[PDB]
């Protein structure tokens, strides 16, 4: 579609606060729902928790130095709500705010643009005790927190993201109960999805009120659905899975409505107050898109809440997570999102892969991660060359970290972390990404 | 006209000697006309002068470090003629030459290409005492100075600019008297304009004689003119203002003549000697080129030409009162390329001034960011239409002495606290840094 | 064919081991055929040898720093076979391997990708004593050495080159005797050419057995031929020169045969055994192309081994070597190679020029070298814009060095070396190349 003079492209890396910071009970930080969830036997593999993680709260200068060495222009990170406002609403924690000031200022000194995500799943436990995302007030608590962060940091930080992956917070956290807070109820999942999206919209309006030059987006993960079957019911299964994973969150933001076919199949009411859909669909400067894999499904009349099930397709390449590797789906997803939702521009805020890494002679050679990265960058640029306005790519992740219910066993870093010593070791994929940033 | 393999683009920042150096009476430097002019009550806002400025004469390593941090590939700077030859013609001041050697070598060690401008308005007072640019000999004194600078520095410096903005030196300095040397006489302004341009041409030839690989250009500022009226006389007002500001200097360089409509309206003769117009129009490797457009209307009573400036209502303006209109930048670039067809164009200055505030040791300047974003976009719009724009130099790296406005008008992407000389990068510096890396 | 999003380009510099390392009798290194050849009166101008060279064995950190300062992404270097296996086949010299480990790891710390060449003319004398490249076993000795290097270093080094410029090793080393080992016999040159090419193929197969992600190529120099005459015999001279210099080595690699017109004109048998041509023609990930100049020739019935002679065409620009400067030939060569041999991609592994340099006030201003570089980069990008898959460019050389039989008098560096002090002084051409790397 013709690269032209003046066009820009941003290369970054991505992390999140609970997954890397540690210092969970230091620096005035209050507990999050993941501190609580991680204390429940069976919730997280190996009984892992984020108490220490990568100790980035103390080691951030080293990690910023690794970012400068990589040559990224941008760093996508999240602010830990319970580190800066431990009670959820009310008093700012000065020690927590000072940490993010030092992080931001350190990034800027090194030429790196920080990209803050306000909510990456670490809801303060003080707010969960009041109902969390099931409580409509949580959307307003989130918007007030967002306003305070923009008041503190938007003199420097101009590109904001409100929430990350509401699919995970709503459905995995409140319907399937495999993420914090561990609730298993469809109606609660529906309420949570609405208040996450309403929070997004209210926070967007609050940030824009701080200053009109600020840019705001949302990060959505999309899981394209296919079926191996040919029956009419298996084609319906694809539509249902696409509606559950993708359109449930994208349609409110970009079309100001929930997908009617899924609303009907649930048979429950979304707690929409007058004015809510206008707030949720407030115009955005960009979409942050997360992509890792496609899902294969088939019809299943017995399944709940919707009559389809996951299938493990045979004879396909898979990562250490068991996730199918299929880069062509990334190209097609990007084209589809641009056509159906027409975001002004798209940033890939997460893409990456996990494999079993081995340290040999103090080094980590990870050719399968390199291969996934190469093929997904190629697929992203194929979409850009067709005219999709992809303005940057952020690798998940800079460093190995706490992979939620999988714990530390699943390593997404381009830089290895030895958790016994906290040593950082760049992998082969780090050298590859460094080259791609420079030579593209 | 899209990018092809091998195409290059240069990102830079720009300063000038009197505006940043300081050390005005140190290191053997002799006075310039701006040292004198800055001493006249009422000439400069707040009684400011360049005695200290940004103290860059002593702090140049810090400023070079800031350039490397920004990631610029080039640094446009000027050589202070009265620092290197205090008497204007005659002996070199070795201490002054050594300063520019240290500056140049420090830039090259950091990977930065210095782009020297030989004349950015600081004529030695020693030469003003002999008539300055009113004196035809000043063109030759300038060419000899230029030759000596190329002999000293062109082993390293391959891209030269002779003079900067003769509009200001000639008309603002000798007709309106609002810039040094402060003279107010049309014939003097005409003489100065011709001898500035002749000096440009003589210096170009002198530099090329030093080495055939050297490249040379001139820097012209252009101020596109519009009118809000529809009468034929308001259209004439646009022509007169365009001729006075732009064609008076562009036509000699690229067409070997002065614009006849302005010559006729002046009613005076340009002091053209045999050979002059061949010299002035000598081929250039590039044009150094913008801040704003002017709005005008006819005024039969105005002098020297029958037009006056108009302050249009409800337009966006900088802290200087200058209209912000980036589309005019695109159209100017297209016009210059068609009208004068320079081999290539470098934007040697573009930028904006706004009231900056230090808050918590930082400077957030969104209006300057917005001006910069929109003018880079407008520049690339012209490049994508085929205009051969090969680079862009932001005015300025640091806040500095803005001539008759003094220090109150801040053009830097890096703030200077004049009490302490601390440099504080503004939001616009981080924006520019990103643009340099990610384009 | 214009730039599209995602396309990459690699900027590098090139050196070779014997030409820069020095430490010839230190660190356990055994002698090479160039140590021997350089001791023969008359073999090398001024009696020069590589005993000390640029002392890069000790000064590599400074040279790597200069690469980082230039901004190159890649460093093409060669491994000295007699430094790492002094006996040619048998035991590794751990001290020699540790040097290449330090070099590689230092390059990677600086963000530079090392591109190893396994054979750049410094055959162990221990193997020359057994016949060198005249002996078929040398192809297998080379493959065993190559396997050992890939086993040691391919955890980090993913892009390999087997041999460099077999034209020089075979014909200049064994027919004209002007390069080591100094033999002057057509049959020996034919045997050597075949065993170099077989060694390439065997080494390629051995490297790929180490790991399937590794990439392998060969470096060939091509010297395009023209004539000033119009006679049919002068047109035949062009064909003969092209066959001798270029097709003799390119045709086996890409067409699995030797050029029949040259075989017939030699009147000798190439010692081809079963399996050899399949091995020599094994698919490659890229061609490393070296180009410096074109040759002008005319028919000469008295000349041997083929009836043509070199002509010094009148009134053309020439370097300090006496080599014609004609950048348009570089564009046309790249187009011809892409059509005739169709390599998957091409890296310019060497291009550059030598001129008499003068140090003035501690600096070196070399406008003729700048001009050659500018014009040849322009010519290369002209071919890329026509669709030739040129993926990178490596300047010969980072530093002035031992120019084989010309000794140290011929300087190819963009960085000057004062051999009395070993001081490195960047030339004007270094600043030009630094600018081109950044601003393209």
Residue numbers in the entry:
A (entry chain C), C (entry chain B): 0 to 439
B (entry chain A): 0 to 288, 290 to 439
Give me lines lifted from the publication on this model:
Here we report, in contrast, on a naturally occurring mutation of an otherwise invariant residue in the β-glucosidase BglM-G1 that balances a trade-off between structural stability and enzyme activity. They are also one of the key enzymes in the bioconversion of cellulosic material. Our data indicate that the natural mutation to histidine at position 75 leads to the loss of an extensive electrostatic network, including a salt bridge in the active site region and implies that evolution of BglM-G1 traded a decrease in thermal stability for improved catalytic efficiency.
We, therefore, re-introduced arginine, replacing the histidine 75 in this enzyme, creating the BglM-G1 variant H75R. Overall, the side chain and backbone topologies of the amino acid residues in BglM-G1 and its H75R variant were highly similar with an RMSD value of 0.069 Å over 1217 Cα atoms, confirming that the mutation in the active site did not lead to a substantial change in the overall fold. There was, however, a major difference in electrostatic interactions between the mutation site and the active site nucleophile. The naturally occurring histidine at position 75 in BglM-G1 formed only a single hydrogen bond with the backbone oxygen of threonine 116, while arginine at position 75 formed, in addition to hydrogen bond interactions with residues Gln163 and Thr116, a salt bridge with the catalytic nucleophile glutamate at position 349 Fig. 2 CD spectroscopic analysis and X-ray crystal structure of BglM-G1 and its H75R variant. We then determined the melting temperature of both proteins by monitoring changes in ellipticity at 222 nm, while continuously increasing the temperature from 10 to 80 °C. For BglM-G1 the mid-point of transition was at 51.4 °C (324.6 K with a 95% confidence interval between 324.4 and 324.8 K), while the melting temperature of H75R was at 54.9 °C (328.1 K with a 95% confidence interval between 328.9 and 329.2 K). The variant H75R retained its activity at 45 °C over 40 min, while wild type already lost significant activity (p value = 3 × 10−5).
